[PDB]
């Protein structure tokens, strides 16, 4: 298959179909879905690895939205990319202004 | 949905780690959102240059336009590697 022909795990064919049906342009190139699938795979791998590290730090063997929120907000680059986004049941990053702390 | 592919990626990066259904939906929405952003940027780029075909160049430039520095560099490297691999083989 095309996805397996590129050494990828994401569906190249499904991405091609979505690009075609989404009327983004009149025609769609050949390597365009391959490139898009590779980019999606890399981003998913990055966020999933960060979330897995966060979950392991919490002594849990199951990713939950809190872990995803922690992974996203703790990485400056992913935070910049995921700026105006809310994750359901993600909570917030634990912080406290230094002046509010007692003497 | 992208549940299966997200699952395979997760097992590839973290062998023994499950993922809740809510987290799977989160990841599915994230993948859809990023795909939509990239495709929209590529469409805008193609329409800019009077072009009528989204190619690997348009998506590469859209990636370079959307993602932050190191993330964009690594994503571009991965995409180029995959494209060359897919072209060489057939």
């Amino acid at each position: 298959t095309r996805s397996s022909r590129a050494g990828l795990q994401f569906p190249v064919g499904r991405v091609h179909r979505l690009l075609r049906k989404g009327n983004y342009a009149e025609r769609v190139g050949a390597g365009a879905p391959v490139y898009l699938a590779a980019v999606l795979e890399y981003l998913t791998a990055e966020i999933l690895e960060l979330a897995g590290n966060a979950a392991r730090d919490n002594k849990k063997t199951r990713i939950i939205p809190r872990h995803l929120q922690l992974a996203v907000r703790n990485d400056e680059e992913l935070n910049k990319l995921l700026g105006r986004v809310t994750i359901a049941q993600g909570g917030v990053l634990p912080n406290i202004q230094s002046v509010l702390l007692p003497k | 949905s992208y549940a299966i592919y997200v699952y395979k990626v997760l097992k590839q990066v973290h062998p023994d780690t499950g993922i809740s259904s809510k987290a799977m939906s989160i990841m599915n929405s994230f993948v859809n959102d990023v795909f939509e952003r990239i495709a929209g940027e590529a469409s805008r780029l193609a329409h800019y240059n009077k072009r009528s075909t989204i190619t690997s160049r348009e998506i590469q430039t859209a990636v370079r336009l959307l993602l932050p520095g190191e993330l964009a560099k690594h994503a571009v490297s991965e995409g180029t590697k995959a494209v060359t691999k897919y072209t060489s083989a057939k």
């Binding site: 298959t1 996805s3 | 060489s88």
Partner: peptide, 16 residues
């Protein structure tokens, strides 16, 4: 470094 996987995909998808 998955040239073997690419060849298999070019064969498996063509084996169908």
């Amino acid at each position: 470094k998955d040239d073997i996987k690419r060849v298999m995909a070019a064969i498996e998808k063509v084996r169908k």
